[PDB]
Amino acid sequence: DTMAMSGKWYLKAMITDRKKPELVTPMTLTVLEGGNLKAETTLLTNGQCKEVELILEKTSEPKKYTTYGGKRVVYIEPTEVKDHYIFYCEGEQARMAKLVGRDPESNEEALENFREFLRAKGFNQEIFSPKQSDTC
Ligand SMILES: [Zn+2]
Ligand SMILES: [Zn+2]
Ligand SMILES: [Zn+2]
């Protein structure tokens, strides 16, 4: 269900096919009317705390959303552990994959699923793990 995804999450691993954050805060997902989602997080890049607020608009395809006014498409895929999910972002023109989990602790089996996902989508395996912090 959509409501299940609401609440706090941690950005645990990132990769791009083609601005590495030196620090990331937890991510909050809020379920808006109509099944749409709001994603809020803060990132420290170049010594500056930059807030990031995204609206993911539900589409006719489940687990598929659009953001930046249709400029980007975002897919949300589960893993074998109930509290970790894969976000796959594509559009304007780069690709990005993120592992998100409900806790910030290292998780081997979610990481194994993430690497398998990266292989199926043709990313490399040079994964980046941002440093975690409650406040920016
Ligand atoms: Zn957990
Ligand atoms: Zn495994
Ligand atoms: Zn294992």
Residue numbers in the entry: 27 to 44, 49 to 122, 127 to 170
What text does the study give?
IgE antibodies to Can f 1 can be found in ∼70% of patients allergic to dog extract. Fel d 7 from cats is the most closely related lipocalin and is 63% identical to Can f 1 while the rest of the lipocalins are only 13%–25% identical indicating that these two proteins are from a distinct evolutionary lineage from the other lipocalin allergens. However, the prevalence of IgE antibodies to Fel d 7 is only 38%–46% in cat allergic patients, suggesting that Can f 1 may be the primary sensitizer. While Can f 1 shows electron densities for most loops flanking beta-strands, some Fel d 7 loop regions are disordered: Arg44-Trp48, Glu122-Gln127, and Asn158-Glu160. While the calyx of Can f 1 is somewhat larger than that of Fel d 7, both have significantly more interior surface area and volume than other dog lipocalins such as Can f 2 (15), Can f 4 (16), and Can f 6 (17). Subsequent molecular dynamics simulations for 3 microseconds showed that the carboxylate of the ligands samples between the two positively charged residues (R101 and K131 for Can f 1; R102 and K132 for Fel d 7). The negative charge of the acid head group is neutralized by the positively charged environment of the calyx, either by R101/K131 or R102/K132 in Can f 1 or Fel d 7, respectively. Indeed, simulations with 2 oleate molecules confirmed that 2 oleates could remain bound for up to 3 μs to Can f 1, however 2 oleate molecules only stayed briefly bound to Fel d 7. For both Can f 1 and Fel d 7, approximately a 2:1 ratio of oleate to protein was measured. We identified that the Lys131 of Can f 1 (Lys 132 for Fel d 7) in the calyx is the critical residue for ligand binding.
To obtain molecular insights into how lipocalins function as allergens, we determined crystal structures of a major dog allergen Can f 1 (C118S, aa 27–171) and its cross-reactive homolog minor cat allergen Fel d 7 (wild-type, aa 27–170) at a resolution of 1.6 Å and 2.2 Å, respectively. Can f 1 and Fel d 7 have a typical lipocalin fold consisting of central eight anti-parallel beta strands, a flanking 310, and an α-helix close to the C-termini. The most disordered regions for both structures are the N- and C-termini. Both Can f 1 and Fel d 7 have an open positively charged calyx at the center of an anti-parallel beta-barrel.
